Structure formats: C-alpha cells, structure tokens
Design a protein around this ligand. Structure first.
Ligand SMILES: *[C@@H]1O[C@H](CO)[C@@H](O)[C@H](O)[C@H]1NC(C)=O
Ligand SMILES: *[C@@H]1O[C@H](CO)[C@@H](O)[C@H](O)[C@H]1NC(C)=O
Ligand SMILES: *[C@@H]1O[C@H](CO)[C@@H](O)[C@H](O)[C@H]1NC(C)=O
Ligand SMILES: *[C@@H]1O[C@H](CO)[C@@H](O)[C@H](O)[C@H]1NC(C)=O
Lengths: 50, 50, 39, 98, 49
C-alpha cells in the first residue's frame, strides 16, 4: 500500500511499510496455522493380495 | 475542554489462542474442557445391583 | 443426509424492522413498508 | 479379552472419531475468540463517532480518542453529552470564533 | 489516517486521493508519509480556501 503525490516539482511514488507488514504476518499466521502435522498413526485392517 | 473516551483494563489477563495468534491477553476467560471426575458411582434414583 | 432437526430456516433478506455497522436496526430507526421496488 | 480382529476395528474407529472432535474443539474456540475481540472493538468505535456528529460543528480532533470543545463547557454541559442530549445550536454561534 | 492528520487541510474527491489547499513541497510531502505533519503551521492558510 503506498502513496503517490503531485506538486509543482514533479511526482513521486513511495510505499508504506507498517501496514504492509501488518498484513503479511496475519496471512503468515493463517499459513502457519494451516501448515501443520497429524500425530495419528493408522494400521492395516484390510488385505490386498488375498 | 476535552472529553476523552476509553475502555477498561486489568493488571493480570489470561492468554487465549485466536485464529491468527497464540496467547492473546484477555480480561476474562473460561475453561471449556473437563478434568476432575468424582470417584463414586453416583446412582441416585436408579435401583442399583452390584 | 439424515439430521434430527425437522426445521432449519435459512435467511434470504435483511432484518425486519417494521414501524455490526449500526444502520439496519441502527441510527436509521425503522424500515419502510411504502417502498416496494428497491431494497 | 474381546476377539482380536473385531477389537482392532473398534480401536481403529474410536481413535478415528477422536481426531474429529479434538479437531472440531480447537477451531470452534479459536474462531469464537476472534469474533469476541472486534465485537468489543466495534462497540468502541460506534460509541466514539456518536459523540462526533452529536458535537456536530463543535469538536475538532487529535486522534487519541479525545475530542476538543471550542467554548466554555462546564459540568452540566459535560453531563448533557454523556446522556445523549447535547443541543448544539446553543453553541454553534460561538463554536465559530474558533 | 491521512484525513484527520490533514485535519482542516484536505478536501476530497472520492477516488482515493486528497487535495491540499496551500503550497506543499516535497518535505511537506515527506512529513505526511512518516506520520508527523503538523497542521497548525498551515491552518491559517488552509483557510483562504
Ligand atoms: C470470569 O470468568 C469466570 C469463569 O471461570 C467467572 O467465574 C467470573 O465470574 C467471570 N467474571 C469476572 C469478572 O471474573
Ligand atoms: C484396543 O485398545 C485398548 C486400549 O485402548 C487395548 O487395551 C486393547 O488390547 C486393544 N485391542 C486389541 C485387540 O489390541
Ligand atoms: C441527562 O440524562 C438524564 C436521564 O434522562 C436526564 O434526567 C437529565 O436531565 C439529563 N441532563 C442533565 C443535564 O443531567
Ligand atoms: C520523516 O520520518 C523520519 C523517521 O522518523 C524522520 O527522521 C524525518 O525527520 C521525518 N521528516 C522528514 C521531513 O523527513
């Protein structure tokens, strides 16, 4: 999310960091919450070769 | 000459997991799992045969 | 799939106010019944 | 001693269901916790600007949560703001030498 | 956040863009972007507008 100005001396596009890193880590929060592991181990109940 | 506005806080909060954190400090909280049984077959109103 | 409830109504309109953001049942008090085209 | 083959099905089934509820348990709380906090933040903001268009052409702002009245407002005037009956046209004529 | 920072200074159009009412060169344009614009310098001349 950035800025853009306009005046008698030209133009200029900047950015804004505080809001940018306010947004990235929450998705990173959602990512690291979703990227997780099962601890539950399942055996062999049904045969296959007969 | 000014009328500010605020909320309420305590000294010691409790730490709860939201959907985008671990451990946020929150003014009150509530247990949702049960841990303590009663070591007795509470059999009021049922004609029990041991 | 078999549930145990027998009725579970699902909304498809706004809150009915006859005569999170605080305008429907908010600082606009009542609905209109004399408005029949738009919402 | 339940029989071997049928006892393995029950333990398989039970621990399978156990992963389902224990998954449901912690999302239900975490989803609920998130809505609890902005619920109390929504109610903070609705109260806040309610004072603003009540003090319609009267207060400026700083951005801390605090308004700034531009004429002498003693404690009954300070009481009339807090019970939702401030009548701004009394003061609009002298909230404009400011 | 830019709006009540530019408290009695900007009008609006509704595109996402403010409209300053006095000559604001690039240090003035820099003071808005780092959250330290001090509006009472300019409130006396954001009101011939
Ligand atoms: C907070 O939650 C607990 C639940 O353990 C409850 O006993 C208590 O009344 C609640 N309120 C306050 C103000 O502590
Ligand atoms: C099923 O699990 C229980 C422990 O939960 C164990 O005591 C029992 O032996 C298991 N059954 C078989 C057939 O392994
Ligand atoms: C404030 O609100 C109360 C409750 O309606 C009312 O009785 C009172 O007259 C109001 N005004 C002042 C100045 O207290
Ligand atoms: C803008 O912000 C930086 C960082 O605090 C500060 O050093 C600087 O003096 C500010 N003002 C201007 C005009 O750059």
């Amino acid at each position: 999310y950035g800025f853009r100005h306009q005046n008698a001396q030209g133009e200029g596009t900047a950015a804004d960091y505080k809001s940018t890193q306010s947004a990235i880590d929450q998705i990173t929060g959602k990512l690291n919450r979703l990227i997780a592991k099962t601890n539950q181990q399942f055996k062999l109940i049904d045969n296959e070769f007969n | 000459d000014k009328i500010c506005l605020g909320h309420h806080a305590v000294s010691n909060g409790t730490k709860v997991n939201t959907l985008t954190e671990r451990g946020v400090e929150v003014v009150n909280a509530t247990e949702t799992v049960e841990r303590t049984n009663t070591p007795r077959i509470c059999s009021k109103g049922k004609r029990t045969v041991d | 799939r078999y549930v145990k409830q027998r009725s579970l109504l699902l909304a498809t309109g706004m809150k009915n106010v006859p005569e999170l953001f605080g305008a429907i049942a908010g600082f606009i008090e009542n609905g209109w019944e004399g408005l029949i085209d738009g919402w | 001693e339940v029989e071997k083959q049928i006892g393995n099905v029950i333990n398989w089934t039970r621990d399978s269901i156990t992963e389902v509820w224990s998954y449901n348990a912690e999302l239900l709380v975490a989803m609920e916790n998130q809505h609890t906090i902005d619920l109390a933040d929504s109610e903070m903001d609705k109260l806040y600007e309610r004072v603003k268009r009540q003090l319609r052409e009267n207060a400026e702002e700083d951005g801390t949560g605090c308004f700034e009245i531009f004429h002498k407002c003693d404690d009954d005037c300070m009481a009339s703001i807090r019970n939702n009956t401030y009548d701004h046209r009394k003061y609009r004529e002298e909230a404009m030498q400011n």
